[PDB]
Design a protein around this motif. Structure first.
Motif, PDB file in Angstrom:
ATOM      1  N   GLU A  21       0.864  -1.210   0.000  1.00 43.16           N
ATOM      2  CA  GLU A  21       0.000   0.000   0.000  1.00 43.16           C
ATOM      3  C   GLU A  21       0.890   1.247   0.000  1.00 43.16           C
ATOM      4  O   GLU A  21       0.629   2.159  -0.808  1.00 43.16           O
ATOM      5  CB  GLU A  21      -0.917  -0.003   1.222  1.00 43.16           C
ATOM      6  CG  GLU A  21      -1.742  -1.269   1.357  1.00 43.16           C
ATOM      7  CD  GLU A  21      -2.570  -1.345   2.628  1.00 43.16           C
ATOM      8  OE1 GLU A  21      -2.489  -0.402   3.441  1.00 43.16           O
ATOM      9  OE2 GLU A  21      -3.294  -2.345   2.801  1.00 43.16           O
TER      10      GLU A  21
ATOM     11  N   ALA B  37     -18.370  -6.945   2.688  1.00 43.95           N
ATOM     12  CA  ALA B  37     -17.588  -5.890   2.048  1.00 43.95           C
ATOM     13  C   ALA B  37     -16.913  -5.070   3.133  1.00 43.95           C
ATOM     14  O   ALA B  37     -17.591  -4.376   3.897  1.00 43.95           O
ATOM     15  CB  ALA B  37     -18.471  -5.005   1.169  1.00 43.95           C
ATOM     16  N   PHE B  38     -15.588  -5.152   3.204  1.00 40.95           N
ATOM     17  CA  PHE B  38     -14.823  -4.380   4.172  1.00 40.95           C
ATOM     18  C   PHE B  38     -13.912  -3.420   3.426  1.00 40.95           C
ATOM     19  O   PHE B  38     -12.739  -3.260   3.778  1.00 40.95           O
ATOM     20  CB  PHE B  38     -14.012  -5.306   5.076  1.00 40.95           C
ATOM     21  CG  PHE B  38     -13.606  -4.682   6.376  1.00 40.95           C
ATOM     22  CD1 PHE B  38     -14.139  -3.468   6.776  1.00 40.95           C
ATOM     23  CD2 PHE B  38     -12.705  -5.319   7.207  1.00 40.95           C
ATOM     24  CE1 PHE B  38     -13.771  -2.890   7.974  1.00 40.95           C
ATOM     25  CE2 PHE B  38     -12.382  -4.779   8.425  1.00 40.95           C
ATOM     26  CZ  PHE B  38     -12.897  -3.538   8.802  1.00 40.95           C
ATOM     27  N   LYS B  39     -14.445  -2.790   2.382  1.00 37.01           N
ATOM     28  CA  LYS B  39     -13.650  -1.940   1.501  1.00 37.01           C
ATOM     29  C   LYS B  39     -13.314  -0.646   2.227  1.00 37.01           C
ATOM     30  O   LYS B  39     -14.133   0.274   2.309  1.00 37.01           O
ATOM     31  CB  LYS B  39     -14.400  -1.668   0.202  1.00 37.01           C
ATOM     32  CG  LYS B  39     -14.807  -2.922  -0.564  1.00 37.01           C
ATOM     33  CD  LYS B  39     -13.664  -3.925  -0.688  1.00 37.01           C
ATOM     34  CE  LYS B  39     -12.526  -3.377  -1.542  1.00 37.01           C
ATOM     35  NZ  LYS B  39     -13.028  -2.771  -2.807  1.00 37.01           N
ATOM     36  N   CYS B  40     -12.099  -0.571   2.749  1.00 38.15           N
ATOM     37  CA  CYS B  40     -11.628   0.588   3.484  1.00 38.15           C
ATOM     38  C   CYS B  40     -10.699   1.422   2.610  1.00 38.15           C
ATOM     39  O   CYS B  40      -9.969   0.896   1.767  1.00 38.15           O
ATOM     40  CB  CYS B  40     -10.902   0.158   4.752  1.00 38.15           C
ATOM     41  SG  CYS B  40     -11.863  -0.893   5.836  1.00 38.15           S
ATOM     42  N   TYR B  41     -10.735   2.735   2.823  1.00 43.79           N
ATOM     43  CA  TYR B  41      -9.981   3.672   1.999  1.00 43.79           C
ATOM     44  C   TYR B  41      -8.936   4.433   2.794  1.00 43.79           C
ATOM     45  O   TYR B  41      -7.793   4.567   2.338  1.00 43.79           O
ATOM     46  CB  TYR B  41     -10.948   4.653   1.314  1.00 43.79           C
ATOM     47  CG  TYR B  41     -12.210   3.982   0.824  1.00 43.79           C
ATOM     48  CD1 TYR B  41     -13.317   3.858   1.654  1.00 43.79           C
ATOM     49  CD2 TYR B  41     -12.290   3.451  -0.459  1.00 43.79           C
ATOM     50  CE1 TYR B  41     -14.466   3.235   1.226  1.00 43.79           C
ATOM     51  CE2 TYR B  41     -13.444   2.825  -0.901  1.00 43.79           C
ATOM     52  CZ  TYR B  41     -14.529   2.722  -0.048  1.00 43.79           C
ATOM     53  OH  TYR B  41     -15.687   2.108  -0.459  1.00 43.79           O
ATOM     54  N   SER B  44      -6.152   0.653   7.033  1.00 40.15           N
ATOM     55  CA  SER B  44      -5.973  -0.765   6.625  1.00 40.15           C
ATOM     56  C   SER B  44      -6.508  -1.672   7.738  1.00 40.15           C
ATOM     57  O   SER B  44      -6.124  -1.464   8.901  1.00 40.15           O
ATOM     58  CB  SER B  44      -4.530  -1.064   6.321  1.00 40.15           C
ATOM     59  OG  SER B  44      -4.341  -2.452   6.084  1.00 40.15           O
TER      60      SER B  44
END
Ligand code: NAG
Ligand code: NAG
Lengths: 49, 48
Positions: A21, B37-41, B44
């Motif tokens: 990342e 859905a654990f889509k983190c922006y 982390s």
């Protein structure tokens, strides 16, 4: 300067994101710093002349 | 008390519980929900 990355502090972006990342952000920082250094050295060469 | 309730308000009125002055261990978050859905922006899940 942030240079289009997460933040300008490497010690923090490294402990905040996983190495993959951070990789992209680390490369953004790498290119910004390297370009600034190149500019500095070229101007110094002209001044020395 | 937020992820095991009964009337998660509707999207037209999104409820909000300010959480502070504690220690956060998201393992209870992991085990209280069969995540889809654990889509983190900004954060982390590995380092949270
Ligand atoms: C959620 O609340 C209900 C009612 O108190 C309880 O039966 C259930 O075990 C709870 N689930 C979790 C994961 O704590
Ligand atoms: C928000 O959630 C808490 C916990 O379930 C509940 O006590 C509270 O009434 C809720 N607020 C609203 C306005 O939905």
């Amino acid at each position: 300067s942030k240079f289009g990355a997460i933040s300008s502090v490497l010690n923090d972006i490294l402990s905040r994101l996983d190495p993959p990342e951070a990789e992209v952000q680390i490369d953004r920082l790498i290119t910004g710093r390297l370009q600034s250094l190149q500019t500095y050295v070229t101007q110094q060469l002209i001044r020395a002349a | 008390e937020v992820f095991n309730a009964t009337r998660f308000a509707s999207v037209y009125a999104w409820n909000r519980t300010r959480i502070s002055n504690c220690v956060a261990d998201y393992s209870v978050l992991y085990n209280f929900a069969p995540f889809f859905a654990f889509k983190c922006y900004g954060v982390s899940p590995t380092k949270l």
